[PDB]
Amino acid sequence: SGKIDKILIVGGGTAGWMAASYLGKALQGTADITLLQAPDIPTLGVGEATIPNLQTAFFDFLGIPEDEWMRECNASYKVAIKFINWRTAGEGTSEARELDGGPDHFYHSFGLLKYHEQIPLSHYWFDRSYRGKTVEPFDYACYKEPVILDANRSPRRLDGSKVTNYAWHFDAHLVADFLRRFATEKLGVRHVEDRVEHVQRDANGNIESVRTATGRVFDADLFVDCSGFRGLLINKAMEEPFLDMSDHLLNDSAVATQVPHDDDANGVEPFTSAIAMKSGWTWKIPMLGRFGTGYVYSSRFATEDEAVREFCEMWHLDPETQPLNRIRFRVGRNRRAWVGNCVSIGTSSCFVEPLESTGIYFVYAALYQLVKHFPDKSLNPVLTARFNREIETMFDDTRDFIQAHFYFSPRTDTPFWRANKELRLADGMQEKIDMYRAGMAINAPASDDYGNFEEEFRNFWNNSNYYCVLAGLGLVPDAPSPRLAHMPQATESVDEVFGAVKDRQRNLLETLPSLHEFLRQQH
Amino acid sequence: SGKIDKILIVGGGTAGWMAASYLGKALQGTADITLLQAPDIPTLGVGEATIPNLQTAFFDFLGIPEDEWMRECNASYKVAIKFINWRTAGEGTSEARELDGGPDHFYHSFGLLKYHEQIPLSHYWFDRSYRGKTVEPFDYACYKEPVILDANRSPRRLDGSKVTNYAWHFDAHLVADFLRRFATEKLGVRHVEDRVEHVQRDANGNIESVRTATGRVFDADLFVDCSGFRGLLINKAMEEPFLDMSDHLLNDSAVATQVPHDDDANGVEPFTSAIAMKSGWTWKIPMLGRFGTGYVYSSRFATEDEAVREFCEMWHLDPETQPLNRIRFRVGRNRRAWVGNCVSIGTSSCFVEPLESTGIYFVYAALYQLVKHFPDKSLNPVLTARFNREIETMFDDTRDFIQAHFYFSPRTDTPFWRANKELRLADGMQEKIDMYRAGMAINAPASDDYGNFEEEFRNFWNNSNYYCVLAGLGLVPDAPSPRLAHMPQATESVDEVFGAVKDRQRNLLETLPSLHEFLRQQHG
């Protein structure tokens, strides 16, 4: 026993330096931290989309202002994820097809859903919809974001004031470098360039040390595995098994690239695009002067060649000369994230396709859970088990949520879209759906007011999130919430709360600058 | 599948009238409600202890201000529960024995546990206690309440401002009366005084109608059972099994009464007392000029007569002339609270000894869940199942918390106390205990700031509650939270926090009027 004196982080990508920075800040001056990383074959900056608490739960914790890291990571703004062509049949194209008089898209934005007499606006929307009182989509009726996003507006006025919740788009490599400099320079984290040659464990199954290719042996009390999909420590050394989640998620591959973009001519979209394809979907992450894009697909329904072709044709790129990143993912999670004195953080722990921008979130959320369940040398088993429970539900809930994007799509045009309907939802997901169909809110927020992590983490996917995606795809309740028939005054008075959103939509549309205009001035 | 048009409440006591008022307010003008109440012999006003959200979740929902109901119900103020003699051997006495150079008591109050650098003050306390940097009890070090309660101070100044969180003490019969007037006179709930003699069910097994002794028949779309331990609808008619849980709680009985009290000479205690006995514990609920008291015991360890003797002797009452209520109750909950078109609310649904003042809470908490999961005539199975799940965890968590009060008592002097140690905690409770011993908080509040029910129902028993009774009884972590050894700046500044509470204790002690003092005014 005695406190943890030394920590060794293995792996130096985004997760590695995020861990180095978070732990370095949390245990400042009370633990010696070293990170081991060797040169990997370089990849293109295909983009990363994020969520609001990246600032409040991560950069704020580090004491780094939004403007400080944005400027050095050449970041752009994200207000939502625009889902394109998830309800219509056809080829993989960047242009939205037509559906019921308008483009086939729906937004899942960050804006929150206001209550009315203790009930989510979603329920009132559906009540009117079901009774043929409105035909307006859920997102446009309940959020002000869609209208201003259709016009590529900025989430901030030129004077800097914020009008909507938003997150970021950026090249992950730049953030990693920014953090590497911050950790080594400001937090005293020791960076060592070496390749793991051997991991020495003891009779208790814990890691004693790791010997590198140069012969240096690194011993520590706690080992953090940020080696990525390889899982050098957690899977390879500790032999912890990985749980393949292919019975819920068919997508396991990707071919991506970065495309130059003239922002002066076309402007910049304040949102991540999730473009439905024939055997998966494609992301478009707008940055400054370019956009990252990647086709996430299922190797079971498309060969790598076919994916490359579909992806390149969609963007009018030459398959033979376009610099491409061909990736095969390890989808799922370890049976246990933390075993013995080895904690896995990042993709070494778990991974799911970036359909809902959880990649970086999974890292700082887990780091928050590690510090909260921080052990000493006795390694109390309870801290470890509880940590694993939080990680396990964090992932499985996201897994379920994501599967629902595919399971509930109305498309039947390709073998892929049809196969998704043939998979089964996890029992916990089916219950949420049962609830949704019964007119109940799903994990409704206690308040309609991203500032407190514990609260966010505990209620990550809430009623708003589920309605955006579910209603967006077309899945709606079997009937209105029975409680509304007993609230005539409330259903009469909503007309003015739906009116407030319309006014906000109109006023923001006519007063906000374009995202490009705002970026152009800030620069 | 029209909406619910008619609702029949069976049972007209505290739960019955709370259901009538809550439902009448929630469905006002969209449902006809009738309450069927049988005239039987009332009990003595033995007193009810409550929790803060009684006002925010129930009375505020009805639109009834705190002053309006507590004046008409002659209620007093509660700031905490004072646990007396749970750590020392001896007979059942109203007086604290001595332990470690001090009286054997500790408080579990409503006050909030301050966070420090994102960590509950409780953790810093134990860190120092574990290192011999202090010898002060958890409650006195982390709360301002303990000292001003030792002096019977009012939770609010004469000008009326609140200096502490608090709940109420009152005679349940009076509140039920108040709620009956409200429901019948202002909400249109029809009161029928009659006795149930026959309940007819349909082919689906749902309740078709209930016929009374006078031959009247009532029908409805939804039947709420508020008949108490009898479970006339849910258990008898619907045949839903009641799940006894004496494998977690040994107490199944009580001898109770109301004792006159000289407030002018003794003042009024702003707390409920839970006095450990030889085969149970005794509550003391101070009201105006009297205090309700009752001895909760286990029939397998003490005879009814042994209990009345023990109870009377501690309060110096005469067994032969003191009016006494002798009760035998079922401890546990129905396998399902809501079945078909029958919803059980109150003790018809579940019951656990009043050691943590959850009786009335179980009623409005359940009524809140009922309205949230309110159905239409199709009775969507999903709404019923979810409701049932909320009630079941609402109850099981409390059952567990309460069992902990007995399980972790150091006493070994009687068969009763030794017997509690041989029972087993439920897996969930065992996990919580493991967490606690590891220095972890348990269901820590997402914030250190009772106004938002949904949030409270989820985090009902939080870290401060567990520490108050667990540490109060003497169960503390195996070692300080591992994280504190990595927060020298935090464990340095924390002392400021402790000094701040010691300051507040000081001021409030010097400037607060006695509760009696404030009470006289609240009425005159």
Swiss-Prot record, chain A:
Binding locations of L-tryptophan: E356, Y450, E456, F460
InterPro entries tied to this protein: FAD/NAD-bd_sf (IPR036188), Flavin-dep_Halogenase_NPB (IPR050816), Flavin_halogenase (IPR006905), Trp_halogen (IPR033856)
Binding-site residues, FAD: G12, T14, A15, A38, D40, E48, A49, V196, T347, I360
Location of the active site: K78
Site (Important for activity): E356
Binding site for chloride: T358, G359
SUPFAM superfamilies: FAD/NAD(P)-binding domain (SSF51905)
Keyword field: FAD, Flavoprotein, Nucleotide-binding, Oxidoreductase
GO molecular function: monooxygenase activity; nucleotide binding
UniProt effect for mutating K78M: Complete loss of halogenase activity
Enzymatic reactions: L-tryptophan + FADH2 + chloride + O2 = 7-chloro-L-tryptophan + FAD + 2 H2O
EC numbers: 1.14.19.9
Pfam family, one: Trp_halogenase
Function: Involved in the biosynthesis of the indolocarbazole antitumor agent rebeccamycin. Catalyzes the chlorination of tryptophan (Trp) at C7 position to yield 7-chlorotryptophan. It is also able to use bromide ions to generate monobrominated Trp.
Additional remark text: The reaction between FADH(2), Cl(-) and O(2) produces hypochlorous acid (HOCl), a powerful oxidant. HOCl is proposed to react with an active site lysine to generate a chloramine intermediate, which chlorinates the substrate. However, studies with the tryptophan 6-halogenase ThaL (AC A1E280) suggest another model: the conserved lysine would not form a chloramine intermediate, but it may protonate HOCl during the halogenation reaction.
Oligomer and partners: Homodimer.
Family note: Belongs to the flavin-dependent halogenase family. Bacterial tryptophan halogenase subfamily.
Protein name as it appears in the record: Tryptophan 7-halogenase RebH
Source organism (scientific name): Lentzea aerocolonigenes (Lechevalieria aerocolonigenes)
Organism taxonomic ancestry: Bacteria, Bacillati, Actinomycetota, Actinomycetes, Pseudonocardiales
